[PDB]
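Dear colleagues,

For the upcoming journal club I promised to circulate an example of a predicted protein-ligand complex. I picked one with bromide ion because it came up in last month's discussion. The inputs are reproduced below in full, followed by the predicted structure.
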Amino acid sequence: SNAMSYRNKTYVAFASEDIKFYRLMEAWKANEKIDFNFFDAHDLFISRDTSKPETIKRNLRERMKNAKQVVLLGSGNTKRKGSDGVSFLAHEIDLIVEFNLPVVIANLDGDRTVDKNFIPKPLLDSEHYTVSVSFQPKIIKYALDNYCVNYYSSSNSGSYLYPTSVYTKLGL
Ligand SMILES: [Br-]
Ligand SMILES: [Br-]
Ligand SMILES: [Br-]
């Protein structure tokens, strides 16, 4: 219950408006359409009515210290909330930048390119190396297995995509 699997390395961050897409991701795990585990902090968001903001902030920092990599669900709500300096997602994004974690942006409209209008401004301003992929299980896992593993050794900076051959070879 409080013990965490070593294989559960991936934190998923999203704007509260986009919870439907996260639930879809949770369906994929329960129905084994995905081949990776992940965790999140939506429980802390839910408990905001019974918790003071300073308590939520400390609990969130604590939660994110266990992440090795991030899947960021990308939409216009991601950019707005993630750039506004006050929202729950804005605090997540600040920690994600501070902890220098790799980020896979999964574009919720299926865009297989970089859409900077889905990426929060602090993450763009950090110039950290990121990759943007469609919101599809197999490309997300490919990014976790490749980009995220290579993040620290790479000399690249800023926003990348995966070329069409990667999607083709995955049967997408
Ligand atoms: Br776990
Ligand atoms: Br939010
Ligand atoms: Br496309």
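Two points we might discuss: The pocket of bromide ion (ligand 3) is lined by residues 111-113 (CB under 6 Å). Strands lie at 10-13, 38-39, 69-74, 103-107, 130-134, 159-161.

See you all on Thursday,
B. R.
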